[PDB]
Design a protein around this ligand. Structure first.
Ligand code: GDP
Ligand code: CL
Ligand code: CL
Ligand code: MG
Length: 174
């Protein structure tokens, strides 16, 4: 099954992770909305972008979570078709938090096969506290990709979101 916008598939992507890791910055860097004067979003919200992925136009509807209380939290997880689980490579606790985000997603979606990408953000920093091997090991334990990103340099941001969409497509057609 799929969501739609007119005659194109709409993919419901959810960006989760501890506050401060760069969820909003990554989402902004993918939207690349250029009209707006910069505002720090600072409230949970969703954002749309039309993209052509492997020849196929689609709509991305991206929920940039704050976590805080959201009454919609379980419903967003049920709606969401794939999840970016974001930590910051200089924030060990944010990395250790990932397990709990995955536990919540599995609780709601009743699946261990939910399309997800582990995202290690802030890769532009000249020093780090979570090693690449730690992160690839965790991703391997989940059977999901690990991608290093920076919302500052924009390295890996496209790979992260488009890999997630491709994971959804693969999961949908299995
Ligand atoms: N150095 C660096 N800083 C980042 C990156 N992404 C976000 N930040 C910074 O980390 C802070 C938190 O970013 P924000 O997008 O609000 O994180 P969120 O709370 O996860 O949405 C801000 O001061 C950003 O400038 C990144 O890739 N590299
Ligand atoms: Cl699923
Ligand atoms: Cl690309
Ligand atoms: Mg945010």
């Amino acid at each position: 099954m799929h969501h739609h916008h007119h005659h194109m598939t709409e993919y419901k992507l959810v960006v989760v992770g501890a506050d401060g890791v760069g969820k909003s910055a990554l989402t902004i860097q993918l939207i690349q909305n250029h009209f707006v004067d910069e505002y720090d979003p600072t409230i949970e919200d969703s954002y749309r972008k039309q993209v052509v992925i492997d020849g196929e136009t689609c709509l991305l509807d991206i929920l940039d979570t704050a976590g805080e209380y959201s009454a919609m939290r379980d419903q967003y997880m049920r709606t969401g078709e794939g999840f970016l689980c974001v930590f910051a490579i200089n924030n060990t606790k944010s990395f250790e938090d990932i397990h709990h985000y995955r536990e919540q997603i599995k609780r709601v979606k009743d699946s261990e096969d939910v399309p997800m990408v582990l995202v290690g953000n802030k890769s532009d920093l000249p020093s780090r506290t979570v090693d690449t091997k730690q992160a690839q090991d965790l991703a391997r334990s989940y059977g999901i990709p690990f991608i290093e990103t920076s919302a500052k340099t924009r390295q890996g941001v496209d790979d992260a979101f488009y890999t997630l969409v491709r994971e959804i497509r693969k999961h949908k057609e299995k």
